[PDB]
């Protein structure tokens, strides 16, 4: 789990809806039976999936959280100074325009 969380990043560049459902023939209009399509979808929903987390990680990716501190030159020095100041029991007023 830890490895698959850390090293799964890439997502498809382009996706086309109404094609995943059409691949299996399970849609509103298809040559398969109207009720035969219901049995298989019910069975599939009852079927569990052990690869779900990989599916979530390979569809939408979030741009981390720490990089906000990393991506600004002033923020790193501000964090260092604030940590040093708090460890010594001080309080600060910040000013900006």
């Amino acid at each position: 789990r830890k490895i698959i969380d850390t090293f799964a990043v890439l997502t498809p560049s382009a996706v086309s809806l109404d094609m995943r459902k059409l691949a299996l023939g399970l849609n509103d209009d298809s040559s398969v039976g109207e009720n035969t399509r219901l049995k298989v979808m019910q069975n599939c929903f009852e079927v569990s999936n052990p690869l779900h987390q990989l599916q979530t990680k390979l569809t939408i990716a979030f741009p981390d959280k720490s990089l906000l501190q990393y991506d600004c030159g002033k923020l790193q020095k501000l964090a260092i100074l604030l940590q040093q100041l708090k460890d010594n029991g001080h309080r600060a007023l910040i000013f900006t325009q």
């Binding site: 059409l22 691949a23 023939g25 298809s30």
Partner: protein, 446 residues
Amino acid sequence: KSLSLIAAHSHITGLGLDENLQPRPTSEGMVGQLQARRAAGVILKMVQNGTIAGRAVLVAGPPSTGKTALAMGVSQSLGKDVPFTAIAGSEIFSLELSKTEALTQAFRKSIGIKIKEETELIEGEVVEIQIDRSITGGHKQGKLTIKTTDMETIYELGNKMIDGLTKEKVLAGDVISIDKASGKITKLGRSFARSRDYDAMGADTRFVQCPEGELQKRKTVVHTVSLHEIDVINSRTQGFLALFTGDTGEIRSEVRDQINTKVAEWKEEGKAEIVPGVLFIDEVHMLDIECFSFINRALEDEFAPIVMMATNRGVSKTRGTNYKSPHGLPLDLLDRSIIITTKSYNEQEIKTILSIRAQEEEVELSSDALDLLTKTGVETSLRYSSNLISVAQQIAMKRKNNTVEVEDVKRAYLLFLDSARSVKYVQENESQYIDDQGNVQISIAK
């Protein structure tokens, strides 16, 4: 339409001819090749007749003498609504399908059928939908109101189509088309009614619409489908997906026989028409003896389209065998076909072609520049000049002048080499390139 950048045959627009099948000296893109042009026109008329099947014509000649150009011309002059499948000989060898199956699919793709049906249609502006719940007296009490340009009328829904209009969020005040038998609802956008009510929607609705006529009429729907599409459709549960994924996988012969019988029954039942298009094969010498043997029999079938072939070589060794044959084709296949030959090109014809290419690539040429390009084309080749003319445009723009002069052409000639010059340079310094046996000298000294 069909957004494209440029093609080597972009200027060609449907051959060039008269009402008497006579070729003009210069018309619709191509020049010269009068006899070949008239032969292509005769073949085109034969194709348009549609009463003759399985004819093989082989266009042969030296390279760069209007062969693919002639094929593009006949394809364009044939127009749409008639299939034209152009394939290369090197794309039949596949790891998924046997060459026979690929050739059969190519043959079937080139013949189409038009299926005509008659359907009643209901069109007009809808102004209000009313929907009720489930009641003992009636399962669903729903009504629809339709406004045409001249009529307003009330329809009553019969417990199913309400699911049709609730499957997708539709709303009143727009023109829609609904089929009595099919039951499909097609929302064409938004009605006209009052301009202001739909003038602030942020474009959309496909430039709105206005009701035209009455409520219901009777129209004819024609569907054009290739035969190969029919075999793919009937082969599997969902073959229309295979029409894009390309995993048909050697459809069985029983399906093809059933398709043939049913299509014939339709044809003498008056329910469908047949359009026998054209199949064109470039670089036919790249095929195999097995493919030629299969073509020998596939040509004689009733549903055999007109086949055109393009080859360059003369008296070469056919692939899959060990003997030399003319055109790279076996004797029997040559006997089964009709040969159209092409000649070389005159200096005047080369100049006219270069001028056509110039006006096609929005490049202005001075008279002396065109003369120099024509001289180079006569000396070396047509395609070299047809490339130099485009490459000199950037050099011209580098001098901040749009017109192309002699200096630009000279610079392009001295910058980009040619086959003869490259061969001479290679033979002069063969010790630097990699030899046939793989011996190379890299050190400058000694």
